[model samples]
Target: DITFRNIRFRYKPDSPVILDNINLSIKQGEVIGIVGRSGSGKSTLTKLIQRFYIPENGQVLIDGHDLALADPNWLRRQVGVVLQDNVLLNRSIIDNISLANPGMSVEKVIYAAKLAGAHDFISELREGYNTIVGEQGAGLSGGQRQRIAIARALVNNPKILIFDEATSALDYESEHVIMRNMHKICKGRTVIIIAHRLSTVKNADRIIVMEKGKIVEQGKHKELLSEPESLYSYLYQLQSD
Candidate 1:
């Protein structure tokens, strides 16, 4: 389990708190979605988990181990993140997917690509896995680039997967297809999805709504939507229109 207890964070001493008195617990294998307006602290919460910043107060614990005391490199191996604008090096598809484990077998790299829904499209390419992606993945479409990024992250088989606006660049059909397949791709791994689109998180096990750096509401999509005045409902309603 991952636990955040009374957490607080600020980029600078005088800066307004980006995360304030936050407390949350996530169980292994559970999928959760976080939604909020920009600057509401949703991304900052994940940054803390990524160990990019240590909280000014409180603790972040994974299975009861204090993150502050853990080895950064060791912690990273357990977490995989696919972000809004994930980068790909100027390398072949196979090389980028297996960058972490450079000596990984071809079969394994292909398997990761299949899981990320990139294999079929990649196989249709002129050189297949050998096709070189331009700097920062210039040649591929946005959805294709995102899928490759997902494939890259999946190659490691980390215990936790984070998708921060990961499918935002995709069309509605592509987004839904990837989101449907993500369950199998993320099986047995804790999944955290940060999204602005309510549809993207409609099927998540739980949805957490944040405002001004605080968790204003949390529950399953339907449950939260049932409350007409809830932040989640309001956000969902706004998007529906």
Candidate 2:
């Protein structure tokens, strides 16, 4: 269980708040979607969950462990976060993926690669899993790097999964492949998805629309779509254009 109670946060010496009294609870195994315009505090929210920022006046809890009380390393073991931008070490694909869990078996590494849609291309490399990824996943296409990043994230099997703009930067074909598989993989775990592509999250169990650091609307996907005047509905229409 994850809970945010009247969460409020702001940068040092800033009057305007980035998160304004946010009240939300996410239970285990829930598939949650967060969508908003640029600067709507989407990334800020993810950062809080990831413990990158300490809320000024709110509590964030994971299960019974309060983030403020838990050890940073322990909290990280329980949470796995993947950002839109891929960050890979200047090492071979195998070594990069293995970095997630240095104790992981070769078979498990291959399984993680498959889950992230990197197995097909990875199998074709001259050194196969050993092919170097260079600095920041260099020499690989944007889509390829993103897939490999995903594989590294999944190799950990963390209890909580946070996708910080998971599919927003990939090509349509790659996004479709990854997003479709994500649906299958997201089952039976707590997933918080920050999505820029409306279609990517249309099927989510709950859609939260954010604006100006506040939750403007929250409900089932269908309910939000039915509310013509709702911010999410308006955004959907704009996307349809």
Residue runs of model 1 more than 4 Å from their true location after superposition: 135-138
> Top model by lDDT, which number?
1
Best by TM-score: 1
State model 1's lDDT: 0.87
- Give the Cα error of residue 15 in candidate 2, in Å: 4.0
In lDDT terms, how accurate is model 2? 0.83
Q: To one decimal, what is the Cα RMSD in angstroms of model 1 from the true structure?
A: 1.8
Error of 1 at 138 (Å): 8.4
Q: After superposing candidate 2 on the true structure, give the runs of residues whose Cα lies further than 4 Å from its correct spot.
A: 135-138
Candidate 2, residues 35-101: lDDT per residue as tens digits?
Answer: 9998788878777887888899988888977789999888888887888866678888889887857
